[PDB]
Amino acid sequence: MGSAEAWYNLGNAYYKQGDYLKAIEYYQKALELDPRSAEAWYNLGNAYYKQGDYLKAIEYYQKALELDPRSAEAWYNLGNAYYKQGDYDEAIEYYQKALELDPRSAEAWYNLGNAYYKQGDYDEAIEYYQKALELDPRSAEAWYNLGNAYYKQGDYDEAIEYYQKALELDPRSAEAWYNLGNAYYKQGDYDEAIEYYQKALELDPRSAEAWYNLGNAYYKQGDYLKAIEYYQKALELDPRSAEAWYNLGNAYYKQGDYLKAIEYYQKALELDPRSAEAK
Ligand SMILES: [Ca+2]
Structure with missing residues (x-):
């Protein structure tokens, strides 16, 4: 029917300002006038998904691929539901399908990485992320x-080289600086991690995980009083943290050993400028 369309075009009219309830109804209206328009069952799925309901999004994604099984846009948003639900297993294969029909699509590829990255099988996640950049750098x-899916493998020298770029592209990401630091902190480097953790806090200073990794930087350096200061902050931020305490206790009672190292050394130095000669 061509009256369906006036309804569909009511659904999409609301879609493109929000009230997805409204679109659901007007779609559900249109769907009775023509339960053979994919664009309706699709955009029915595309409402339900957007709210939070996915089981129903899948139902009304399957039934829209019963009609037209010839659009990535249908396969792409189809894999998502699952990803966005949890079942990465499936989202993948469902993705691949959309990459057979519509290969050249950053968003399709990228998410494949996101899928494989999320599967723990990073080796393979790389491949797709490569393709995605290769099309869209x-x-x-x-x-x-x-930079993330190298970090987890252990290639920091690589993962640094990749974060590096990202930072160029969007220096406006707090939760990037933090890894860029962490990359340094994993190898034999703890200074650059501070210059960079410092930044991460310049951007988001109510991220504690930063304040605490920043603390960590100083304990490996041995500035324990300054380290504490950063764990201090990170405790007002997460009072229930388990090893908020243990670590902060370790930091206090570290310094201990230091001051007492100063003592015993200063007091060996007072038993050999008058109980020894030169050597
Ligand atoms: Ca494999």
Whole structure:
């Protein structure tokens, strides 16, 4: 029917300002006038998804691929539901399908990484992230995620090189600086991690995990009083943390050993400028 359309075009009229309830109804209206328009069942799925309901989004994604099984846009948003639900297993294969029909699509590829990254099988996540950048090398998010899927493998020298770029593309990401630090802190480097953790806090100073990794930097250096200060902050921020305490206790009672190292050394130095000669 062509009256369906006036309804569908009511659904999409609301879609494109919000009230997805309204769109659900007007779709559900249109769907009775023509339960053979994919664009209706699709955009029915596309409402339900957007609110939070996915089981029903899948139902009304399957039934829209019964009609037209010939659009990535249908397969792409189809894999998501699952990803966004949890079942990455499936989202993948469902994705691949959309990459057979519509290969050249950063968003399709990227998410495949996101899928494989999320599966724990990073080796393979790289491949797709590569493709995604290869098509579209302006997605800050890829270089981040890529720098991420090297970090987890153990190639920091690589993962630094990749974060590096991301930072260029979007220097406006707090939760990037933190890894860029962490990358340094894993190897034999603890200074640059501070210059960079410092930044992460310049951007988001109510991130505690930063304040605490920043603390960590100084304990490996041995500035324990300054380290504490950063764990101090990170405790007002997370009072229930388990090892908020243990670590902060370790930090206090570290300094201890130091001051007493100063003592016993200063008091060996007072038993050999008058009970020894030169050597
Ligand atoms: Ca494998």
